[PDB]
Design a protein around this ligand. Structure first.
Ligand SMILES: NCc1ccc(C[C@H](NC(=O)c2ccccc2)C(=O)N2CCCCC2)cc1
Lengths: 39, 156
């Protein structure tokens, strides 16, 4: 059923779109691999 | 089938039409993705078959054809790029300065970018283009935005 298709090369691109912030979050990781916020 | 290094889409035909469930990285003949994308199921690459080799639900990672090969780490200072491969859209690099996930077991880098869920598995790169982790396992913050961990495995 599941199949893979190539999407591109893995390279750093000079002058890429720069967006997104840098938050510091307290988190917990459970046995099922779920992250959760501790506030 | 196709074993060339690079970023790949992970598709299914179980739902309506062809649906993208995630993304992965082929490096050194090993296919790397997140556990929630495939649930450890076998993959098809043209006429060839890729069998799972290693996996761990807690790390939310799985490797195919061989052991985990991605060993680069975020330096905790520099900006990085998410090589986002969104459903039905072209691969696009997005530069961002990672935040932090503070856990009782140590700190992990985090990327605050919002893409559809089918983008899970897209690699996160350092300045030399080395894969320092995969995007797609994280948390939703108070404003409904998504923050993903920079999830990296261990090379033996
Ligand atoms: N065991 C259940 C389970 C937990 C976690 C995941 C991964 C999921 N990934 C995205 O939703 C996502 C969104 C945008 C871009 C890329 C990935 C995620 O992190 N959450 C889902 C639920 C909400 C907050 C946690 C899947 C299954």
């Amino acid at each position: 059923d599941m199949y893979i298709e190539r999407a591109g090369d893995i390279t750093w691109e000079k002058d890429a779109e720069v967006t997104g912030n840098s938050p510091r979050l307290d988190v917990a990781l459970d046995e099922s691999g779920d992250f959760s916020l501790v506030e | 089938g196709e074993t060339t290094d690079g970023v790949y889409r992970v598709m299914t035909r179980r739902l309506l039409g062809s649906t993208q469930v995630g993304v992965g990285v082929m490096q050194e003949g090993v296919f790397h993705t997140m556990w929630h994308v495939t649930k450890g199921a076998a993959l098809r690459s043209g006429e060839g078959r890729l069998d799972p080799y290693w996996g761990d639900v807690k790390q939310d990672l799985v490797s195919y054809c061989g052991p985990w090969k991605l060993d680069a780490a975020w330096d905790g200072l520099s900006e990085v790029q998410l090589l986002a491969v969104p459903p039905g859209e072209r691969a696009k690099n997005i530069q961002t300065l990672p935040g932090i996930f503070k856990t009782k077991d140590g700190d992990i880098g985090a990327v605050a970018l919002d893409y559809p869920a089918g983008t899970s598995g897209s690699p996160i790169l350092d300045k030399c283009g080395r894969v320092i982790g995969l995007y797609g396992n994280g948390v939703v913050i108070k404003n409904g935005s998504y923050v993903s961990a920079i999830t990296q495995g261990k090379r033996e």
